């Protein structure tokens, strides 16, 4: 189904995003998070949660790449 494919893509993009951010590859990590946000029916709610979790300059960079 389309749903298992999408869940998988969403989760794998997040996991690569987190790993990249942990390595200090902020720009690359953010690019993958923007793919995860793009397939979500609630982008604003994902953005709120990322604002509460990410360092402010990475969140801000996120906002500019969306």
């Amino acid at each position: 189904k389309d749903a298992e494919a999408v869940q998988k893509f969403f989760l794998e993009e997040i996991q690569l995003g987190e790993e990249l951010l942990a390595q200090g590859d902020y720009e690359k990590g953010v690019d993958h998070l923007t793919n995860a946000i793009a397939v979500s029916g609630q982008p604003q709610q994902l953005l709120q949660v990322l604002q509460q979790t990410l360092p402010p300059p990475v969140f801000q960079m996120l906002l500019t790449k969306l």
Partner: peptide, 11 residues
Amino acid sequence: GXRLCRLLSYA
């Protein structure tokens, strides 16, 4: 890792 996945799925 994997935490970011749960926070965002639950969002």
